[PDB]
Design a protein around this ligand. Structure first.
Ligand code: ADP
Ligand code: ADP
Ligand code: ADP
Ligand code: ADP
Lengths: 70, 100, 292, 55, 100, 275, 353
């Protein structure tokens, strides 16, 4: 219930972070290794509108990761 | 201008109203405070939630969330101004015919 | 440390009073001892004759190892389905240990909150090494036996670390050397199999169905409390005893004595005895027919 | 009549909300209420001392 | 200022929520960080002026109720609702002329 | 109102008797006593104190880890209170009053009598086992159709001649928050020992006694406790249980208490059943 | 008589009440400094007249008066658990040679740990980043815990063992902070070394999430990641990890960084078991008749402790006859027959990598 309150705090920070609109200032940048339990209101329109995933390194990136280390 | 309501709802809109129950009655009590009201199923429009079993029971109460409400709208209680909305593509649309 | 005497706003420490904690977490079970001795029960002798060493040789015969530089056995296990009778026997050996005994069991390893059982075992071996020499014997190891393997999830998977710390105290830590600990289960079926070592469990003694040696003697020592019309085969049962547990034989003389009760009889006879054999087991009534 | 203007001072000024828990069979009722505060009440009025009941 | 600066320490002050009122004139109110109380009138605002589930100022001395304030329940619900989706209107939508 | 009028009268004597013993809060368990004058007591308010007594309390009459009364100013020892746990789920599980006596039997004679000689026949005369005893047996086994289960308990309800015994409902044993009912089955027996031999009966013992196991993943693990935990409650030397036991079920499984009952219990009998 | 009065005059200093601990958070003016009690109320008070704020700084453990709450005295660093994780001692050192096998397990871990300490130049000579940790696993064979325990008192320098049990901390399992609280002195006492047994049960998957006690687990993992995910350089600490299996840890740990290298144990070879019996046969003296390969050729596919303990158990089984010295005869029987019973539960010991 305290954590429920800290996820109400997550809700309370969900609440009062939209006061950034508009202008100054924030960059909300997010990372997770598992997308399972992320709530819909966390991905809410106006919260996460842009998704970056992990592209796997490949022949370019390999030859880049081959050259950059050595 | 009729007020708008959705379905679950995570995680923490549940016990925030009441303590524990079938939990749909308190939502049915919400519409008694404000009428006309609009209730909605958010979302369960997808082909991915099926699983053919594991998503059934997860959808079954999402399906039941309309059923027991339809049973608490038409079956008994009262009166007008309350509505529900569904969305899907296929599969459960044919499973809607199981309910329909 | 703990318990430093201070009163309110004074905030000064007058004395440090020993020790530790807490209630029944402190003492799981502190008893005098079992009220009878193992010399009454027999037929399992030679294997418990091996077991009583593990408690007695650190109690006394460690001097034998001082010659050649050996260390006493720590891990030991006791198992088999009831009965057997370890429940009486595993305690019955504590009368000859003479050191203070502590009863651990699966329900103790059932934990409301987390870290207690760990802290308990941290404290249990505190109070062990503190009261060393002492005796500790545990039970229902199979309750915490398996960690599952893959998540998700087990509650005892955290409390397995209490056993892993019990291992870490018997493997990664020296101080567990004293206060030899024994374990028991109804079955050894599935647990952490890595437990094989002297630090963790070592002695594995399979207790089979009691045989006609014990089977004749067990109830004989269970019925020595009561009178007997002085002819009883004791082979009759012992020959016809199949799958009969040592505890069932205790109840064989009961219902045999129960009809002797409602017969108004002064003493128990074999015709009353042998009826109690098939009276307690097995099953039926069903019908007797087409053979008669 | 006068009892209403008498025990209102004993009640007064406010009164809390407890949680009825257990009873000493002498009718001294041990309660756990926030935070876990007990008491012993054998009081004569409004009870119905029995049926108020644990829990 | 000093008098209210003298008044307010020996007691404090708080804000309550009425969950019920009594025939004896008392009122069921919680001390929210702690367990609930039940306290009386409070002769300025009567019982019928306020209904259960409303914000009042918990008094700090007789532990009575000082003033009256509005309380919110649906603004938490409707915000959780309005979190999800906006509305727009006919003019801002198209292609649904068949189904509207 | 004449009840209510006399009801508000003696609050004077209640407020005069209020000042003494009123501060007896808080119910507190002790920890250790090093020597004569000293004690250390521990409460659930988080308050832990090493503190003395009120002179009305003798040292040898008190037990370690004992809920006591205290005046939290001096932090004295007022009086120890025996009870500890458990809340009304006990008082729901614990039951009283009679009804449904023998004569409701549907004609079964020695099917009920073989189990009538096990329970109330020794309870009629516990002296009966002075001369001949030996023992009143350990446990029983019951199962079959519904007819007639738990009415033989109701038969024992009306015909109980001593103290009101305790029914046990199955699905309240299985609980969230691992180990909830684990405390209960353990602690309720002392609450039954508080009633000094007053009998107990378990219902749905097949569901709660679940046996045996699958590889993974439990699930049954936390419940694998309760069965063997009851077997520990069975493996407790004392009494056991001075209440004997009476157990009704449906299927032969669960096997572990059914293979533990030859290790402890006795008297496997059966419905009755139609004839 | 005079010393007793000195203790009385000692007590004449003790009526003065002890101050309240504090953490200076930040400051506002020379009379106002942001401070909080350990129970959460935040205050702004004045200092004493001896100090300069250079002796305070924001984010500083301090003390305040009991009434005025004024800033008076202070200490920068304190904690309970740190030093009390240090005191476990392993005989040897020479236990290095007393683990028997195995060379590339023995020798490589020296190059993995020791040389990083003494000569980081040899890392920058080639240009390779220093490994900041190590990983064991098993249990084919065994010795993951002792080889650690041995190297601790062997490698010497500074090392601090992490007891894996008590972290759960009952109420409020936030104690992942304590790893930083431990890492803070690991950044203070640096260099220092850390062994960790059982990272797997604190390696919870949250695969299919359930109940409650898993949530506190996974949260305690997030810091362990971020502590190694810095924003910081832990290189002067050496994190050593071993447990039942290297499986459930989830891929976040399984990558380098968090798991720097792959080291493990298998069933020791009978050639290496020939040496494992010497360190068993060393402390035991008997009649001089020995064939080491006899037990090695008879007793097969065992572990160091499994051999030793049963080999000592054989001596204990043979001394049951009350005779003192025992030839391998009983041991070619006991260790043979006894371990046969011990190999009955050798079942299902083969675990994924
Ligand atoms: N010869 C005997 N004398 C007394 N009790 C016996 C005998 N044989 C079996 N028992 C009974 O068998 C029961 C359980 O046997 P066992 O399987 O050894 O216990 P556990 O598996 O719980 O350690 C004991 O409670 C004991 O009373
Ligand atoms: N011999 C009998 N005497 C009295 N009632 C009987 C008898 N046999 C069957 N019954 C009836 O059968 C029913 C048993 O149902 P129930 O209590 O559900 O059994 P269980 O508790 O075993 O599930 C009772 O209503 C009871 O009246
Ligand atoms: N030669 C040996 N002598 C004694 N103990 C040994 C020997 N070799 C390995 N071990 C034991 O193996 C332990 C580590 O293995 P571990 O995986 O914890 O055991 P298990 O394989 O039984 O789970 C060490 O703590 C050590 O006590
Ligand atoms: N240039 C890089 N590209 C990809 N991975 C890297 C690079 N440098 C380090 N890493 C790896 O990333 C890990 C730390 O990454 P970080 O993003 O903090 O972890 P996480 O993604 O779990 O929070 C280190 O263990 C390291 O092995």
């Amino acid at each position: 219930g305290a954590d429920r309150e800290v996820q109400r705090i997550l809700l309370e920070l969900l609440n009062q972070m939209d006061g950034f609109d508009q202008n100054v200032n924030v960059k909300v940048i997010m990372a997770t290794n598992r997308a399972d339990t992320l709530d819909p209101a966390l991905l809410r329109p106006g919260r996460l509108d842009r998704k970056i995933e992990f592209p796997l390194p490949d022949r370019r990136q390999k030859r880049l990761i081959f050259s950059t280390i050595t | 201008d009729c007020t708008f309501i959705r379905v679950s709802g995570s995680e923490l809109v549940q016990k925030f109203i009441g303590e524990g129950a079938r939990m749909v009655r308190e939502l049915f009590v919400m519409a008694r405070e404000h009428a006309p009201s609009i209730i909605f199923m958010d979302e369960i429009d997808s082909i991915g939630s099926s699983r053919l079993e594991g998503g059934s029971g997860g959808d079954s109460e999402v399906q039941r969330t309309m059923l027991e409400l339809l049973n608490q709208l038409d079956g008994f209680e009262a009166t007008k101004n309350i509505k529900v909305i569904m969305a899907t593509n296929r599969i459960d649309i044919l499973d809607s015919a199981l309910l329909r | 440390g703990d318990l430093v005497g201070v009163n309110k706003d004074s905030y000064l420490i007058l004395e440090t009073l020993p020790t530790e904690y807490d209630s029944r977490v402190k003492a799981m079970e502190v008893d005098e001892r079992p009220t009878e001795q193992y010399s009454d029960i027999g037929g399992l002798d030679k294997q418990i004759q091996e077991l009583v060493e593990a408690i007695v040789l650190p109690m006394n015969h460690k001097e034998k190892f001082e010659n050649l530089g050996i260390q006493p056995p720590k891990g030991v296990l006791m198992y088999g389905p009831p009965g057997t009778g370890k429940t009486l026997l595993a305690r019955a050996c504590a009368a000859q240990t003479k050191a203070t005994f502590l009863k651990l069991a699966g329900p103790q390893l059932v934990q409301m909150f987390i870290g207690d059982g760990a802290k308990l075992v941290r404290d249990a071996f505190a109070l062990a090494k503190e009261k060393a020499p002492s005796i500790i014997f545990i039970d229902e190891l199979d309750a915490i036996g398996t960690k599952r393997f893959d998540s998700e999830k087990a509650g005892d998977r955290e409390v397995q670390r209490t056993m892993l710390e019990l291992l870490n105290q018997l493997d990664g830590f020296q101080p567990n050397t004293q206060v030899k600990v024994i374990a028991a289960t109804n079955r050894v079926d599935i647990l952490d199999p890595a437990l094989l070592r002297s630090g963790r469990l070592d002695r594995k003694i399979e207790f089979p169905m009691p045989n006609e040696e014990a089977r004749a003697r067990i109830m004989q020592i269970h019925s020595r409390k009561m009178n007997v019309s002085p002819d009883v085969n004791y082979e009759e049962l012992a020959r016809c005893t199949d799958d009969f547990n040592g505890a069932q034989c205790k109840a064989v003389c009961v219902e045999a004595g129960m009809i002797a009760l409602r017969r108004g009889a002064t003493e128990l006879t074999h015709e009353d005895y042998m009826e109690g054999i098939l009276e307690v087991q097995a099953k039926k009534k069903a019908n007797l027919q087409y053979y008669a | 009549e006068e009892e209403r203007s008498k025990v209102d001072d004993l009640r007064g000024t406010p009164m809390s909300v407890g949680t009825l828990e257990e009873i000493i069979d002498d009718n001294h009722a041990i309660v756990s209420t926030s935070v876990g505060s007990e008491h012993y009440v054998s009081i004569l009025s409004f009870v119905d001392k029995d049926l108020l009941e644990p829990g | 200022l000093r008098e209210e600066l003298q008044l307010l320490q020996e007691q404090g002050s708080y804000v309550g929520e009425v969950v019920r009122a009594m025939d004896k004139k008392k009122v069921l109110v919680k001390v929210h960080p702690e367990g609930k109380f039940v306290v009386d009138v409070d002769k300025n605002i009567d019982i019928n002026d306020v209904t259960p589930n409303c914000r009042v100022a918990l008094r700090n001395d007789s532990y009575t109720l000082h003033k009256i304030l509005p309380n919110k329940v649906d603004p938490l619900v409707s915000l959780m609702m309005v979190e999800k989706v906006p509305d727009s209107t006919y003019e801002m939508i198209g292609g649904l002329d068949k189904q509207i | 109102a004449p009840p209510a009028l006399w009801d508000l009268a003696a609050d004077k004597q209640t407020l005069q008797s209020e000042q003494p013993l009123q501060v007896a809060r808080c119910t507190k368990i002790i920890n250790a006593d090093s020597e004569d004058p000293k004690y250390i007591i521990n409460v659930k308010q988080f308050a832990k104190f090493v503190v003395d007594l009120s002179d009305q309390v003798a040292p040898t009459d008190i037990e370690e880890g004992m809920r006591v009364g205290v005046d939290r100013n001096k932090y004295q020892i007022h009086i120890p209170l025996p009870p500890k746990i458990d809340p009304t789920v006990t008082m729901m599980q614990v039951e009283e009053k009679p009804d449904v006596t023998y004569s409701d039997v549907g004609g079964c004679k020695e099917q009920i009598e073989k189990l009538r000689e096990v329970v109330e026949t020794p309870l009629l005369h516990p002296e009966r086992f002075v001369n001949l005893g030996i023992e009143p047996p350990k446990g029983v086994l019951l199962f079959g159709p519904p007819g007639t289960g738990k009415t033989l308990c109701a038969r024992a309800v009306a015909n109980r001649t001593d103290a009101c015994f305790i029914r046990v409902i199955g699905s309240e044993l299985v609980q969230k928050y691992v180990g909830e009912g684990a405390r209960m089955v353990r602690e309720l027996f002392e609450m039954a020992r508080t009633k000094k031999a007053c009998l107990i009966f378990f219902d749905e013992i097949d569901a709660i006694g679940g046996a045996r196991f699958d590889d993974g993943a439990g699930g049954d693990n936390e419940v694998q406790r309760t069965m063997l935990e009851l077997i520990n409650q069975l493996d407790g030397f004392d009494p056991r249980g001075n209440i004997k036991v009476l157990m009704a079920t449906n299927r032969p499984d669960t096997l572990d208490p059914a293979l533990m009952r030859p290790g402890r219990l006795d008297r496997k009998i059966e419905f009755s059943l139609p004839d | 008589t005079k010393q007793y009065e000195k203790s009385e005059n000692d007590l004449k200093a003790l009526q003065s009440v002890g101050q309240i601990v504090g953490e200076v958070l930040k400051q506002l003016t020379e009379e106002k400094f942001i401070v909080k009690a350990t129970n959460g109320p935040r205050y702004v008070v004045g200092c004493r007249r001896q100090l300069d704020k250079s002796k305070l700084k924001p984010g500083t453990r301090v003390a305040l008066d009991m009434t005025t709450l004024t800033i008076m005295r202070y200490l920068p660093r304190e904690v309970d658990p740190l030093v009390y994780n240090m005191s476990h001692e392993d005989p040897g050192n020479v236990s290095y040679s007393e683990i028997g096998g195995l060379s590339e397990q023995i020798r490589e871990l020296r190059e993995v740990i020791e040389l990083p300490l003494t000569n980081p130049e040899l890392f920058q000579r080639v240009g390779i980043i220093p490994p900041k940790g190590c990983l064991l696993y098993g249990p084919p064979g065994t010795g993951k815990t002792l080889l650690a325990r041995a190297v601790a008192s062997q490698l010497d320098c500074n090392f601090l063992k992490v007891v894996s049990s008590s972290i759960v901390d009952k109420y409020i399992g936030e104690s992942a902070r304590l790893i930083r609280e431990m890492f803070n002195y690991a950044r203070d006492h640096q260099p220092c070394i850390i062994f960790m047994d059982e990272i797997d049960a604190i390696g919870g998957r949250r695969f299919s999430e359930g109940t409650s006690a898993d949530r506190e687990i996974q949260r305690t993992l997030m810091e362990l990641l971020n502590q190694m995910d810095g924003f910081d350089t832990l290189h002067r600490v050496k994190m050593i990890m071993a447990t039942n299996r290297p499986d459930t840890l989830d891929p976040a740990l399984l990558r380098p960084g968090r798991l720097d290298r792959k080291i493990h144990i298998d069933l020791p070879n009978e050639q290496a078991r020939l040496d494992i019996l010497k360190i068993h046969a060393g402390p035991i003296t008997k009649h001089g008749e020995i064939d080491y390969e006899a037990i090695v050729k008879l007793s097969d596919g065992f572990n160091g402790a499994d051999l030793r303990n049963v080999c000592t158990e054989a001596g204990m089984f043979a001394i049951r006859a009350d005779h003192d010295f025992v030839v391998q005869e009983d041991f070619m029987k006991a260790v043979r027959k006894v371990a046969d019973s011990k190999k009955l539960e050798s079942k299902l010991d083969y675990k994924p990598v």
